[PDB]
Amino acid sequence: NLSYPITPWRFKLSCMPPLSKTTFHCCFRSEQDRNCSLCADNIEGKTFVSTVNSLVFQQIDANWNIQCWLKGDLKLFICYVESLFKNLFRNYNYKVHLLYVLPEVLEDSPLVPQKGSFQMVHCNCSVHECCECLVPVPTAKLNDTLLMCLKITSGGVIFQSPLMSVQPINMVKPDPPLGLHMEITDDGNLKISWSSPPLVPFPLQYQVKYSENSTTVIREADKIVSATSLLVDSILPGSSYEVQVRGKRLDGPGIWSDWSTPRVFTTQDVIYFPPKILTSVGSNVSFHCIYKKENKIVPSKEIVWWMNLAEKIPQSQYDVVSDHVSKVTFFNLNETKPRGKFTYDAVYCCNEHECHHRYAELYVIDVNINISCETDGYLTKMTCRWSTSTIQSLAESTLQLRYHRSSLYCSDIPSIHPISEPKDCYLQSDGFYECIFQPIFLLSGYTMWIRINHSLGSLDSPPTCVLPDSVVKPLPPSSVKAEITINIGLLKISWEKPVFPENNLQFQIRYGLSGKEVQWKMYEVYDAKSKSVSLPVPDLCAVYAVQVRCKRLDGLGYWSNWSNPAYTVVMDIKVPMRGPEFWRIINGDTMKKEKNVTLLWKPLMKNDSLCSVQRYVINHHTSCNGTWSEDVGNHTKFTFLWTEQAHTVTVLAINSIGASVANFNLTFSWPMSKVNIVQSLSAYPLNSSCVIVSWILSPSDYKLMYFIIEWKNLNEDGEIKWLRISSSVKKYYIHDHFIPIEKYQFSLYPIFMEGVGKPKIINSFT
Amino acid sequence: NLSYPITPWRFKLSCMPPLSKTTFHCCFRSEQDRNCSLCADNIEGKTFVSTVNSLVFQQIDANWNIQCWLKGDLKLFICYVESLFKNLFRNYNYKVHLLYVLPEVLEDSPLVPQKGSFQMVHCNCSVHECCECLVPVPTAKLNDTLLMCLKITSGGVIFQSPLMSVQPINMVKPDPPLGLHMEITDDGNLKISWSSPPLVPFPLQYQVKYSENSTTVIREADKIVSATSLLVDSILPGSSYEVQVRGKRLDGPGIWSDWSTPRVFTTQDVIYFPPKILTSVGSNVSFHCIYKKENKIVPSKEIVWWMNLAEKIPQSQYDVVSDHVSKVTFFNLNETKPRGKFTYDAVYCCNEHECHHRYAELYVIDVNINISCETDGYLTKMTCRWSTSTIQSLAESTLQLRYHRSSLYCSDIPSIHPISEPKDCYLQSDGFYECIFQPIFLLSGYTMWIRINHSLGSLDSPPTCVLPDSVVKPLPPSSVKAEITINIGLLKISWEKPVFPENNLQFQIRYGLSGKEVQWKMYEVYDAKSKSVSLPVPDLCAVYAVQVRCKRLDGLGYWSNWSNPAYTVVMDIKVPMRGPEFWRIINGDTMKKEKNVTLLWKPLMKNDSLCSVQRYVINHHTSCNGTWSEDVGNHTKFTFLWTEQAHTVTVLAINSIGASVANFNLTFSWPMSKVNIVQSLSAYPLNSSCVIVSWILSPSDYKLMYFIIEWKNLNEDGEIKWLRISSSVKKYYIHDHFIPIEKYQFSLYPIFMEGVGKPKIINSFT
Amino acid sequence: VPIQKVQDDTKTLIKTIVTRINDISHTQSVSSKQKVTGLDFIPGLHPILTLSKMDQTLAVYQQILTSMPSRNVIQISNDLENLRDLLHVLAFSKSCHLPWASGLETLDSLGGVLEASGYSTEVVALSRLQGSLQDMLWQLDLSPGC
Amino acid sequence: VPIQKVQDDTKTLIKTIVTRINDILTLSKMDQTLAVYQQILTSMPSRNVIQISNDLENLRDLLHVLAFSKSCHLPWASTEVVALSRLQGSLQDMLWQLDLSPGC
Numbered sequence A, B: 001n002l003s004y005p006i007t008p009w010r011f012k013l014s015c016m017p018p019l020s021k022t023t024f025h026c027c028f029r030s031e032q033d034r035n036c037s038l039c040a041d042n043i044e045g046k047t048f049v050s051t052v053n054s055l056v057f058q059q060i061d062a063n064w065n066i067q068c069w070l071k072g073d074l075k076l077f078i079c080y081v082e083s084l085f086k087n088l089f090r091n092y093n094y095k096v097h098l099l100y101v102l103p104e105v106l107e108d109s110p111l112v113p114q115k116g117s118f119q120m121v122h123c124n125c126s127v128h129e130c131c132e133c134l135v136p137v138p139t140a141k142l143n144d145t146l147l148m149c150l151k152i153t154s155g156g157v158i159f160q161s162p163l164m165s166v167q168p169i170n171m172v173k174p175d176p177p178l179g180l181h182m183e184i185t186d187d188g189n190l191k192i193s194w195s196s197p198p199l200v201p202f203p204l205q206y207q208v209k210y211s212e213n214s215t216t217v218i219r220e221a222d223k224i225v226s227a228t229s230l231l232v233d234s235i236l237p238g239s240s241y242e243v244q245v246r247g248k249r250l251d252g253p254g255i256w257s258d259w260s261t262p263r264v265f266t267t268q269d270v271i272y273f274p275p276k277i278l279t280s281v282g283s284n285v286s287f288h289c290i291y292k293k294e295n296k297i298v299p300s301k302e303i304v305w306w307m308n309l310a311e312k313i314p315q316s317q318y319d320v321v322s323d324h325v326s327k328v329t330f331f332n333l334n335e336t337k338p339r340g341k342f343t344y345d346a347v348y349c350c351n352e353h354e355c356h357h358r359y360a361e362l363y364v365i366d367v368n369i370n371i372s373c374e375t376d377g378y379l380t381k382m383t384c385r386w387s388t389s390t391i392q393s394l395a396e397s398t399l400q401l402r403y404h405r406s407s408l409y410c411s412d413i414p415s416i417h418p419i420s421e422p423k424d425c426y427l428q429s430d431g432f433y434e435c436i437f438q439p440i441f442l443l444s445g446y447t448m449w450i451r452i453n454h455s456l457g458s459l460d461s462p463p464t465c466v467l468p469d470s471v472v473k474p475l476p477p478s479s480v481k482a483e484i485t486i487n488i489g490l491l492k493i494s495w496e497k498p499v500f501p502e503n504n505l506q507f508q509i510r511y512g513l514s515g516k517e518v519q520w521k522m523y524e525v526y527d528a529k530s531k532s533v534s535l536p537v538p539d540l541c542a543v544y545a546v547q548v549r550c551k552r553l554d555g556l557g558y559w560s561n562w563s564n565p566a567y568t569v570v571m572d573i574k575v576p577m578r579g580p581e582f583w584r585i586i587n588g589d590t591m592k593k594e595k596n597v598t599l600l601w602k603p604l605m606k607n608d609s610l611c612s613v614q615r616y617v618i619n620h621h622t623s624c625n626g627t628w629s630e631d632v633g634n635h636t637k638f639t640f641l642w643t644e645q646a647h648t649v650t651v652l653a654i655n656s657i658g659a660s661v662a663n664f665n666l667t668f669s670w671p672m673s674k675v676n677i678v679q680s681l682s683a684y685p686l687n688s689s690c691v692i693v694s695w696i697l698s699p700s701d702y703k704l705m706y707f708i709i710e711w712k713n714l715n716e717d718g719e720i721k722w723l724r725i726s727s728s729v730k731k732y733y734i735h736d737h738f739i740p741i742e743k744y745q746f747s748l749y750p751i752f753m754e755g756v757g758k759p760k761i762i763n764s765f766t
Numbered sequence C: 001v002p003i004q005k006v007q008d009d010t011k012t013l014i015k016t017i018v019t020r021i022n023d024i025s026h027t028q029s030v031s032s033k034q035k036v037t038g039l040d041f042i043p044g045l046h047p048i049l050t051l052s053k054m055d056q057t058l059a060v061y062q063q064i065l066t067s068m069p070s071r072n073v074i075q076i077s078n079d080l081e082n083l084r085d086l087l088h089v090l091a092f093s094k095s096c097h098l099p100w101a102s103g104l105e106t107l108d109s110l111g112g113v114l115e116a117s118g119y120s121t122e123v124v125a126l127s128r129l130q131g132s133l134q135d136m137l138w139q140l141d142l143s144p145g146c
Numbered sequence D: 001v002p003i004q005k006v007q008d009d010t011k012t013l014i015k016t017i018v019t020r021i022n023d024i025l026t027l028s029k030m031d032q033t034l035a036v037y038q039q040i041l042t043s044m045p046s047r048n049v050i051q052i053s054n055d056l057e058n059l060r061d062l063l064h065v066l067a068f069s070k071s072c073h074l075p076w077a078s079t080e081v082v083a084l085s086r087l088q089g090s091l092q093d094m095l096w097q098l099d100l101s102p103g104c
């Protein structure tokens, strides 16, 4: 009762007669109805009004355009009042008093509101007679009843509006939608996606305007949708779209939202979808194209696809989709080299003999990035690293590692287990990264991969399963000890295995002569419980070097470092095999029965001494078994005397280990010294470095086994020189310094089992 | 009217009688006039004054010295008021008010200024009876009329000065001259140019009170010349000048400027016109001196011109300009070598023997820096370098390169172009300055040179145009390869020309044999279209080395590097040209037809079968043409069964190219094996290395081609080796080892068309 | 300088420029008669006879290449400047004074096309330049008119 | 995964853990023991102790694996020196008992 529904929202108010408190009631002038209901503001204003004052109403036509709604924020019921009588000559300073109430849902009679129930808000009018007013309404009463009453105070005259009741929510005018962009999606379909206001509590239907506007073909296609974002169908090239969207309530009546500034989106003569593609090496891609030529769409049966404007694509890969949509599908494509500052391939679409300058981009990124890494001997730190200086196709992306490992192991089956935990790894000057894991589960199987983010998308390298306990690098063995054996002649290597790992190990020894550069020899031991080895070497005590490495037996893990080399020490091993080749000389008168005989011999050479023999000795044997021993020191010449008929002498070598075993012998005897068997000797210088000696002999009774020839210079008293000759040969060659001018002698002696007889002496070359 | 001109600027004011508002009138006591005009400040001051108070005027004498003038800056009209009553017993705190008005130019009557038009500025009175009044006078009103009135309040007594009209523009006090630099003219006229003050917009009459503070001559000539660039002729030695030029307003009245600091400049008894000249190698200059030797001044005909205290310049360079001015012209002086702490030549002018110590400087610069340039092979940059390790004459002078460009080629007319562009060249460790132009203009004229800055001046080296296309250094040739031609014997070298430049090119090619130390032979190619050259060499399987290099044919440009040398690989070239030897060592028996035939041949050497043999072939031939030749291979011995009666043999060598073409041959004949043509031979062993061999012949009934000679030792069956000389020789020698100890088989055989007769087998020497 | 020196120097400079163009990796195999419907202000295609049209073509090419920052383009532009200043001498040899042609106002669309299809522009420009220069050489033997 | 290689891994890891700690019958009882050792070892944050603990749960997970190998759904169940000593002692006890490989 006493309420006129606002059907529709638009209504025009006109005030007609029924000066401090002169109030005039105003009514709506509709097409067929005229309602005049008194408001609950003034009840005692029934005062007599003079007839003359009505003449003022002739000059004052109180016509007003009053409207309002609830804004999308559901906070303010801003109301607008416009003055139809736009008289610029006189401006009225009128004040608006608004009484609004929001009664609650009461089930006990629809009682008329009393005085003071409404709220007073002084409504603000602009300079140009337009009044905007703020009405705070609680959100819990949006579906409830709201009452309006307006009082206009213009020049001391009050104008009264009727009571208006309407639901705020059913005629809410939304805000102009924003957050809109116009790009071609990946299926040849423009999307008009606007961030439709969230403060609206009800679904909204939107009127959306656009068209196909071109230079020649012009048509208008205005539409109405209901979703917060729409997706048009079959965009054609060379057609401007003037899109503009406004909102309103979808269910029941409502007020359209504010018109926004029109958005213009113009596509060029060739349209590609998708325009940019990011794909790794070895995959398959696809494209699309629509062409317009002098305002006419080219049929799909005469279109050819190019590549960098360099080589035409073979026709085998072309596919037909519709009247004006084509398809090109690259098969097993390679990596795109960087051509100058351009890091992408351009793919064109064109017909006949003309190709437009618009192109579709195509990037290709390689993803085979290698990761491989250790576990240090203490089973704590795990260190690894991946290259990025070879692979180009980058310098345009940030990179990051990932983890995934929980139970015991890995390398079972895809997928990469999309749960992952990033970890940051640093950079080093070598050109490769690295980063450290600790503490590490030695028996947990990590799954690693590299993720490449890029300006267009994301890519993932193939994973890798790594188990730390199986990639350990052991520490090199300590206390390496090489020592030449005793009484045998072998090289002995001894050592001790590293504490980690606790698996079985194999060792690889490498050894050789000590020196600046050596051609070392390798040897393998395949037993964990063997820890010392013995090997043969050619020499005896030439110093040697040895080094050792360790590895796990089953082939897992990596090799260790080379140990600190441990050189040996030189020291003698055993007794010499052979004594000296010792010769006699006599310096005394022949008439003497006592002869001062001097024994002379060369110093022994290394391998005969096996290393070193520090002492020599002489031993004797008379016919009466007279035997004795005496030291000579490091003197290689000794002398003694001989008077008894038959006396043998022996020269021995004594060193650190013991006396020699196999040694030569020789006996002196005057009685058999009177025997000669050599008849003639000849010597001749072949040249300055070769002399030939030959001899003709005679037989005897005793057994002859070796000769001896003694030569010395005759111009100067040089050292006596001799060398062994076997009795078997009859000719010999002598190779040393010689000059034919000076004079030399020779003296060949036959020696039997018990002495030397008469010699053969020659004073010149024959 | 009511205005008295201020003539002159110095005036004295005395106040005379006509207590809070007692006004006294003051007048100016001129020499012939007494003007008393009432000011327009007070009109209502006509108040009766008691006669008794006049006695106070007895004790107060209002004598004021007022001086008003415009400052040089034309900003403040500073006025000074001084109290002539210098009474130290009592100091009155009198206040001075200066009423100043500057009426605008009005053409409608000379109206008297009214009350309140005068501007009032408080004067800054000081303790010492000096009051300073600062009147802000705009520059636009300087030419206008300035009216002044003075009011003095002393002990309640008011003194009013007459109104005075004056133009501030005419009365200007200038500033003392600045920049009084003493620089004697190149003609010795002693320019004393001083910079005129900038705040003075009109020429100034300069009262030049220049003095001559010499030992005996004193001058105080006060020239009033207005020229700033003063020129005092006939400069005298030992004449210090203390110029006291202060200046005055030339156009209109003014006041001499305040005395500034004296400009004491002492001429130390030796004066040259500026000895501050900088010279170059070969340049010629001239000097003049005036010396003081007590007040007589040494005449120009008695000068004792020296440098380094000695080497009196001859009276051939001498020319007389004035009585005390003499020309000592220096022609093409050499570089002034430094010594001690001197970087010049201590020029000395003196008289007789008493010569002073003050000297002059002779600066000589070896400006000749030779700049070189070189253009990169890719034709992108141009590197230019220059050395300064010869500048050691006046070092620490700064050096900077300047370059100038011309559109196409540079002209042949030598002229240093007026404008230039600097270029900073960086220092290099080799003692050179190197700098790069990039990008380059190929056919544009770069004229570049070096400017030197010394503490005395600046100098330029002669320019050297460089055209960046005439100094290009081409790249070395690419893909150089040499190979030995087959079936011809030549060596063919092929190469590919570099990319840039694009003119014609010549080539130099050097070849030799490989080794640590290489030998070289050079060949030239002038035609540009040839890419392969063939040349003959004697050696045929040496490891060869070939290198090439380029240059432009027109002669402009540089020689390129030498390319990477191209070694050659030895391979088969032709078939062997000569077959190998072969001989009979048959060990068969006489009656057996199938006799054990053995043939010997030495492996063929390198330089005959063209450096490679892998397979042999032993050609055989029966009377029935039995050609079973088989393949000996690498083996060098052969045996055949002697199946048939008459046999012929032949040895051939087969390489990869093919088989032998020219060959030896031999035939077999049982019957004439019983013929003899030789009846004696002689074997004389003169020495073991060479043995003399002779034989005799008979009238053989067949034709004899050659002889074959063989030898062996019977005693030990020594090696069998042989020789194949022709029949022409008679007494041939053999050159190899022998021994007279043993006895040798000699084997001389004549050679006939079916074989050999009886051997001439010999057992011993002759 | 003798005129024959100028005649040979022109050929040398032309060959140097064309080899520089061949050094570029972009324009390795594109041909010079390819038709693109958006780039028609690039000189080329139809043959050029007169000296004035030749200088105009080089001026347009210089203006077009000014809009690229690569070093090779800078060097080629410098060489084009030198070649133009040289060709005016051949014009002056036969008393046929030429003006200093300016960057034609027909370059209105250039910038726009750039921000749309940069890559393509670059390629086509260089390629056509090379092709045009070839024609120039084959016509400089026949001594074309003023 | 095949089970025949598991026991070698058990022996290797138990030897490794006893060796590193020296550097400083039924399945349910086994698991509850190991679990209480984990708790009584968690209290000490020393670098050796924390890593020994982190190496203990690999042993515990492997113990669960070997329990599941026999088709047995095993239910889930001055101080520091002595603690480390008793850890080691229980460890060689575990080694000796798993040498015999008892039942569930």
Ligand SMILES: *[C@@H]1O[C@H](CO[C@@H]2O[C@@H](C)[C@@H](O)[C@@H](O)[C@@H]2O)[C@@H](O[C@@H]2O[C@H](CO)[C@@H](O[C@@H]3O[C@H](CO)[C@@H](O)[C@H](O)[C@@H]3O)[C@H](O)[C@H]2NC(C)=O)[C@H](O)[C@H]1NC(C)=O
Residues within 6 Å of the ligand: A283, A284, A331, A332
């Ligand atoms: C990306 O594209 C490549 C290229 O193959 C192309 O696409 C296929 C779908 C087919 O239409 C091919 O005709 C076409 O050239 C694909 O590689 C292809 O994979 C298939 C299936 O594995 C291969 O077929 C097999 O060929 C072998 C003989 O090699 C037969 O024994 C098999 O029975 C089976 O037919 C085909 O050979 C192979 N193409 C080439 C050139 O090797 C690839 O699969 C595709 N990518 C994806 C993710 O599908």
Ligand SMILES: *[C@@H]1O[C@H](CO[C@@H]2O[C@@H](C)[C@@H](O)[C@@H](O)[C@@H]2O)[C@@H](O)[C@H](O)[C@H]1NC(C)=O
Residues within 6 Å of the ligand: B282, B283, B284, B331, B332
């Ligand atoms: C410097 O002077 C040299 C010779 O001295 C005089 O100069 C010439 C010009 C003649 O007048 C000669 O008779 C004089 O003796 C010249 O050789 C030299 O070129 C002169 N230097 C310069 C830069 O001209």
Ligand SMILES: *[C@@H]1O[C@H](CO)[C@@H](O)[C@H](O)[C@H]1NC(C)=O
Residues within 6 Å of the ligand: A331, A332, A333, A334
């Ligand atoms: C990839 O490169 C190979 C050889 O470099 C070539 O044969 C193949 O055609 C390339 N791939 C494509 C898609 O062209």
Ligand SMILES: *[C@@H]1O[C@H](CO)[C@@H](O)[C@H](O)[C@H]1NC(C)=O
Residues within 6 Å of the ligand: A398, A451, A452, A453, A454, A458
């Ligand atoms: C780098 O890649 C990560 C991976 O998700 C991504 O979140 C991040 O935005 C990328 N950084 C960029 C694109 O700058």
Ligand SMILES: *[C@@H]1O[C@H](CO)[C@@H](O)[C@H](O)[C@H]1NC(C)=O
Residues within 6 Å of the ligand: A377, A473, A474, A475, A561
């Ligand atoms: C092996 O030796 C190198 C060089 O001394 C060293 O850098 C490296 O760390 C060593 N390896 C191990 C596992 O310690």
Ligand SMILES: *[C@@H]1O[C@H](CO)[C@@H](O)[C@H](O)[C@H]1NC(C)=O
Residues within 6 Å of the ligand: A648, A663, A664, A665, A666
């Ligand atoms: C001395 O040695 C030789 C050679 O072994 C031997 O024949 C001889 O019997 C030895 N002398 C003696 C006295 O045994």
Ligand SMILES: *[C@@H]1O[C@H](CO)[C@@H](O)[C@H](O)[C@H]1NC(C)=O
Residues within 6 Å of the ligand: A686, A687, A688, A689, A690, B737
């Ligand atoms: C001396 O003759 C022999 C004979 O074979 C030879 O070996 C040796 O080299 C010759 N010596 C000299 C110095 O020529």
Ligand SMILES: *[C@@H]1O[C@H](CO)[C@@H](O)[C@H](O)[C@H]1NC(C)=O
Residues within 6 Å of the ligand: B398, B399, B400, B451, B452, B453, B458
């Ligand atoms: C050398 O002097 C010239 C002349 O004024 C000057 O232009 C140049 O900059 C100077 N060189 C220097 C200061 O390095």
Ligand SMILES: *[C@@H]1O[C@H](CO)[C@@H](O)[C@H](O)[C@H]1NC(C)=O
Residues within 6 Å of the ligand: B377, B474, B475, B476, B561
């Ligand atoms: C010529 O060889 C020298 C010596 O190696 C080298 O420095 C120079 O760069 C070479 N020339 C060219 C053009 O590369």
Ligand SMILES: *[C@@H]1O[C@H](CO)[C@@H](O)[C@H](O)[C@H]1NC(C)=O
Residues within 6 Å of the ligand: B648, B663, B664, B665, B666, B667
């Ligand atoms: C062997 O060859 C020579 C060379 O021509 C020839 O004179 C001779 O007759 C040949 N011998 C035979 C038996 O043919």
Ligand SMILES: *[C@@H]1O[C@H](CO)[C@@H](O)[C@H](O)[C@H]1NC(C)=O
Residues within 6 Å of the ligand: B686, B687, B689, B690
């Ligand atoms: C051997 O004698 C001959 C002639 O008597 C002589 O020419 C030759 O040089 C001698 N031999 C030596 C090695 O001097």
